[PDB]
Amino acid sequence: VRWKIIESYESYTFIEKWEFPRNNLQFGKTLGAGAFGKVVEATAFGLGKEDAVLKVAVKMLKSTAHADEKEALMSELKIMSHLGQHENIVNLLGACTHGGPVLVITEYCCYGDLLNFLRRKRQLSSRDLLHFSSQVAQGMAFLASKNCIHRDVAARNVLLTNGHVAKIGDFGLARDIMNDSNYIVKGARLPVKWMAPESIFDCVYTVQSDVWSYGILLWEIFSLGLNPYPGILVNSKFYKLVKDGYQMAQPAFAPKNIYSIMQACWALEPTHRPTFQQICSFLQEQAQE
Ligand SMILES: CC1CCN(c2ccc(CO)cc2NC(=O)c2ccc(C#N)o2)CC1
């Protein structure tokens, strides 16, 4: 769904410098769009203290959006302005909230999404896959430290920028959810194959829930982009399987130790799942290549 700050975990949750001239923005092609929003590539002139002309990403609402939509965009803006910067996050760089529609300026990731990258690379080395894994875990450990839940951890939501470095961000407003069959209609469109059981059955969303999803992301990375639960449709049988403890088989390119992380992330009991900080350390130790 969308990023959100929750109460207590790990740390402690206690709670217009970003304004940029929209005329100093030169819009380019649209990168993606959803039911009520879209993100476009653009060039910003004189942005930041370095007065760069760098290429950036600009998120904005569509004509079909109303108050509720506008608030969600402002809320994301507010969350990003509060989180602070991190190397593996699609960082906020500015915003245009006056003199026209609200625009949120973030870093642009030239290589696009990790899922498509893996599919066109089926060269990639085992070391590269481990790096992708570590960078996302670093970003997730960062969010966890700010009591921020992601709720849509998946390879399609990991972007690659200069140096093929992975970054995560809230792409919900530009995600084409209505036409993506991976988002299952539920009353709501949810990425069921990536969701933890408690999120599916109890509608509970916590950092541990994102850990489960991170395990599914690992399976996507080490299978070089296969759709999770291959050939299995989302329905009663699927839900019964996951609830009953079913887990996907080890991916073709995952070393046993990496598969062990997936299994840990998929522990049915949320408190039996590792933390993102523990995952980072294990990956740091390499565990396996
Ligand atoms: C939901 C999808 C997220 C990724 N997507 C991009 C596709 C291709 C490229 C490379 O040309 C870049 C993409 N996106 C970004 O660099 C970026 C920064 C912030 C956002 C947001 N939302 O998307 C299209 C929409």
Tokens of 98: 């006056």
Taking the C-alpha atoms of residue 239 and residue 242, their distance in angstroms, rounded to an integer, is: 5
70 is in an annotated binding site: no
Nearest to 130 by CA among 255, 260, 263: 255
Nearest to 166 by CA among 213, 217, 121: 217
Taking the C-alpha atoms of residue 105 and residue 91, their distance in angstroms, rounded to an integer, is: 9
Rounded to 10 deg, the angle between the 256-265 and 276-284 helix axes is 180
Tokens of 274: 């590792």
Taking the C-alpha atoms of residue 114 and residue 3, their distance in angstroms, rounded to an integer, is: 19
Closest ligand 1 atom number to CA of residue 33: 25
Tokens of 37: 């929003």
DSSP the chain: ---EE-SS--------TTB--GGGEEEEEEEEE-SSEEEEEEEESSBTTTTB--EEEEEEE-TT--HHHHHHHHHHHHHHHHH---TTB--EEEEE-SSSS-EEEEE--TTEEHHHHHHT-----HHHHHHHHHHHHHHHHHHHHTTEE-S--SGGGEEE-GGG-EEE---GGG---TT-TTSEE---EE-GGGS-HIIIII----HHHHHHHHHHHHHHHHTTSPPSSTT--SSHHHHHHHHTT--PPPPTT--HHHHHHHHHHT-SSGGGSPPHHHHHHHHHT----
CB atoms within 10 A of CB 18: 15
35 is in an annotated binding site: yes
Asked whether 31 lines ligand 1 (CB < 6 A), one says: yes
Residue 12 CA to ligand 1 center (angstroms) comes to 31
Sole residue written with tokens 């980072």: 280
Asked whether 112 lines ligand 1 (CB < 6 A), one says: yes
Which residues does residue 107 pair with via DSSP β-bridges, in sequence order? Answer: 56
CB 200 within 8 A of CB 242: yes
Residue 112 CA to ligand 1 center (angstroms) comes to 6
Asked whether 59 lines ligand 1 (CB < 6 A), one says: yes
Taking the C-alpha atoms of residue 17 and residue 209, their distance in angstroms, rounded to an integer, is: 34
Asked whether 39 lines ligand 1 (CB < 6 A), one says: yes
Q: This structure's resolution (angstroms)?
A: 1.9
Closest ligand 1 atom number to CA of residue 173: 22
Q: How many CA atoms lie within 13 A of 35 on its CB side?
A: 9
37 is in an annotated binding site: yes
Given the residues 152, 170, 180, 202, the one annotated as active site: 152
Sole residue written with tokens 């991976």: 182
Q: Residue 35: CB partners within 8 Å, gap ≥ 6? A: 62, 64, 177, 178
Q: Is 202 a catalytic residue?
A: no
What domains does the chain contain, in order, with CATH numbers? 13-108 (3.30.200.20), 109-283 (1.10.510.10)
